[PDB]
Design a protein around this ligand. Sequence first.
Ligand SMILES: O=CNc1c(C(=O)O)ncn1[C@@H]1O[C@H](COP(=O)(O)O)[C@@H](O)[C@H]1O
Ligand SMILES: NC(=O)c1ncn([C@@H]2O[C@H](COP(=O)(O)O)[C@@H](O)[C@H]2O)c1N
Ligand SMILES: NC(=O)c1ncn([C@@H]2O[C@H](COP(=O)(O)O)[C@@H](O)[C@H]2O)c1N
Ligand SMILES: [K+]
Ligand SMILES: [K+]
Lengths: 516, 517
Amino acid sequence: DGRRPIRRALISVYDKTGLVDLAQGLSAAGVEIISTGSTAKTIADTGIPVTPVEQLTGFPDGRVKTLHPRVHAGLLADLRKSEHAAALEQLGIEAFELVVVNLYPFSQTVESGASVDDCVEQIDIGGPAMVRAAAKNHPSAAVVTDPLGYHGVLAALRAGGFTLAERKRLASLAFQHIAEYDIAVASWMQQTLAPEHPVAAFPQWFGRSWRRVAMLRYGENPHQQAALYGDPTAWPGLAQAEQLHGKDMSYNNFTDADAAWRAAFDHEQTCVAIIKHANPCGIAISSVSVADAHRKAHECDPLSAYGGVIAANTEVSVEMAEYVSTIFTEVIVAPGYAPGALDVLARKKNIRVLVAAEPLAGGSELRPISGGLLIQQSDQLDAHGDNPANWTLATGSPADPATLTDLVFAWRACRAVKSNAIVIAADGATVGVGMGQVNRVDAARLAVERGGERVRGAVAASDAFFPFPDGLETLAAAGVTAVVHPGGSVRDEEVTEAAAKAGVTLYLTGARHFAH
Amino acid sequence: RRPIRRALISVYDKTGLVDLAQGLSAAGVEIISTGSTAKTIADTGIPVTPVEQLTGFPEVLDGRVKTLHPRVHAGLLADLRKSEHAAALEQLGIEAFELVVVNLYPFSQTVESGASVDDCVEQIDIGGPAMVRAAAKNHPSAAVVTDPLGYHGVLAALRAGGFTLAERKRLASLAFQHIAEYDIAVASWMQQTLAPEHPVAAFPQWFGRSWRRVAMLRYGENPHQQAALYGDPTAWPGLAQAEQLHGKDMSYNNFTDADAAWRAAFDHEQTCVAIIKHANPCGIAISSVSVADAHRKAHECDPLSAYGGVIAANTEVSVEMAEYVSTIFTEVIVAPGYAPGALDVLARKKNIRVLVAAEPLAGGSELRPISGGLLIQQSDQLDAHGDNPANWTLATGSPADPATLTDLVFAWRACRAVKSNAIVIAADGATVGVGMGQVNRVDAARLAVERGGERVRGAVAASDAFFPFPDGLETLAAAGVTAVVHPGGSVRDEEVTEAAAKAGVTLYLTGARHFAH
Ligand SMILES: O=CNc1c(C(=O)O)ncn1[C@@H]1O[C@H](COP(=O)(O)O)[C@@H](O)[C@H]1O
Ligand SMILES: NC(=O)c1ncn([C@@H]2O[C@H](COP(=O)(O)O)[C@@H](O)[C@H]2O)c1N
Ligand SMILES: NC(=O)c1ncn([C@@H]2O[C@H](COP(=O)(O)O)[C@@H](O)[C@H]2O)c1N
Ligand SMILES: [K+]
Ligand SMILES: [K+]
């Protein structure tokens, strides 16, 4: 088992939470406590005897208190080797079985908005060196870096020490915390201490760590395994969603929920988005209710909504839940659910019901690629051209207020559709969506075929300019009255002429919204 | 700015050390060093103060604690801006270090060749990182160099009367990046090898990674978004390490498309060329003749969509292929290499980005970030039990002739790279109709048939997921498709099998799914 009885413990903690309880426990079991500064005073003020580190070393400007061989030899001596044991005995140095250290809170000093000098001062040197030394010498030493493990220490103390397996685990955790601490120190120094000139949108180095939340049902396909990880520092998202009902989440369930969440919060009005394979099959807004927004979004493409992922940018009502319960739905994500809505959704056993925190706009997006990573600013639909006031009317009569709000809806909805994308919309609802096409005219053909009869009199949005007039002709031939696209082709006037010939209102934004 | 008087050197890699040491010694700098670093310097006749003289502590525990001493760290950590700290050093008899040169044993680089658990544990450096962190924390006084790359900078600093405060801040920032990279590597190895969890978990409880900026891209997904490319120095080279031989700067989409085209091409054993548009193939083809034949076949699938496409070949691009690529509007071409004269033919068009990438190593993990976290999965290597045609179930119709079967295997493997819901119609080792990224399976079948046109009659088809209803299969059968391959697995499978039986279509069930997003 490899249990070693605890005889000497080295305690040097910034956070003194649970320290007196731990110290009482250790002292009662005849453990010698060796401690530094304010940790030693906290213990001694209770009457518990404590050996100062200065008595061990015989050396007294603060910043270098435990960086001494009479500390580190006791931590690093491999007691499995006779020659290391003999060296300690000859130097009159005893080993430490237990090392309890928690570091200067650097990330919290930064989080409180302290100066450069104050944050630099909270960079611990001795602490990580003690933790790494005890972690490296896990066959002999046990290292605890959080007051959470203190009852584990008193339990191990009662059991005649920690096992070898327990000490390996503690060492592994110790090195994770040191890596997290250093990521935080390196990230802050790059940003605040030594930034680039001229200041750059993305830094020269990027580092992050995550903690496993759960194993998923499977990956993108059942022969692939997958896991979900959370970023404890980040603002809560889908990775922190609360599951209130249903079978376990798969990888695709999470990617779809994330895509549906983003598509719903891309609208100011009450909005419901229905997603299939990271693409919307139906999006709608309402000035009436969530239920009306869900009905409109579902009626766009009921055949595709089968096994869909639903997101609402407001509380799901009982009225909406009743309709969702009659449709095959895999996932529903919302900022909350009205009294009785969860019970209506729970009528179907498998549907995953999630509660998520409302999104925080203006972040950076990570996109991994083979051998590396792409980092970009997220498309927040806030470009100069995303404001309809900044649109250029290329041909036709200006849109009436109802036609314009539909154009803004179709325009904002085209962001979430994978490229090449065409969104045909009317009365704040999509009627035909042409997604993920390798050419623009096929995306226009798709949206027209799906839209069916509802295309006549509707508006359309193109996420990129029409390179040739055929894509626009497809929409005009189907009865689309107004079209909004970025413009920007050398062939723009051919496209504008085709819309002029058809008597179609055409707007140019100068802003593009590809998504993949 | 501070003149360098005392330097602390402890380097694993001794590259440029003697040139640095002769530079420092000539400028009257006292070198404080230990072990093999001190011998390398002394063997040249350059005087060196051993760390053991400074500490006065004997040779114990295989050097595990040699520099963890206050006469080392007080010299590093004394804030010389505080008269009190400067007064403390005098009262204790400890001099300051203006320069700290430390390079560690390459832990990350040797985990793959780590002899045992005990040997890797022994390689964990304690003193080294503590010296680097201490000098980095005390950057207002100390300069910390962790790579022989910065030695030229040190000699230049010696000529100008020391490093500036701004230079020392930058060095400290780099020092902490290297420390963080070292610790990510030690933490990752301990989780995996030292203390793994029981029962066996495919993905560990903690995951950490860092990247280094390679370049700023033309723009992000759209021009109003900025973007940058980062590389993983520990990983096997991929698209992030590609060498650009020609063309305008790469955009974010150029890289995502190149990555998708690279993966689609290496999904085939035979000579293969994939043409991608918005992360989806518009044309894929294999050849037993040449790369040029594979590119022509793939381009013929959909020439209108190949306009502004991203091309990947899983073999060397020939002159013959470059000559056809030069007549077509192409944004990016990625290949493991180019034949003599092929690059010159490609360079006839100014803007085309010509890239050379390392052949991929199968069986890795994929990262997919989501709001507030990350999804990690095993990559789909097309090696499931059902990916072997020998393990397919013939549900109806006559068994496929050898030519029909090889086309089915091609269509099947090609359907992996197409975004879901996906349908691939193929013939003679080439796609003729691709239905991609559809919110419903029957629309993906309709797309593939409309694009395929006349070519669909007599061709084979592959579905990346089962047909939930017979309509998607009826669409293919009504168009003249002779054989179809899909996973099966629906409660409605027999309705789908009956529809194929009614049409006299050969139908195979694999039991393996290949969604991609
Ligand atoms: O960077 C300095 N940190 C060091 C050192 C050293 O630099 O020699 N020794 C112990 N520590 C840490 O000091 C804190 C505990 O000391 P107190 O007991 O006085 O609060 C805890 O945060 C311990 O990490
Ligand atoms: N056979 C199909 O077309 C199919 N099978 C499942 N799905 C949908 O794929 C999504 C991912 O399913 P899984 O959670 O099995 O990864 C869920 O929306 C699901 O209804 C399909 N479109
Ligand atoms: N207007 C369009 O449909 C369009 N404009 C550009 N593109 C293609 O988008 C891809 C990415 O372009 P960029 O690098 O600008 O992001 C390249 O293939 C490019 O030819 C389009 N499909
Ligand atoms: K889009
Ligand atoms: K696929």
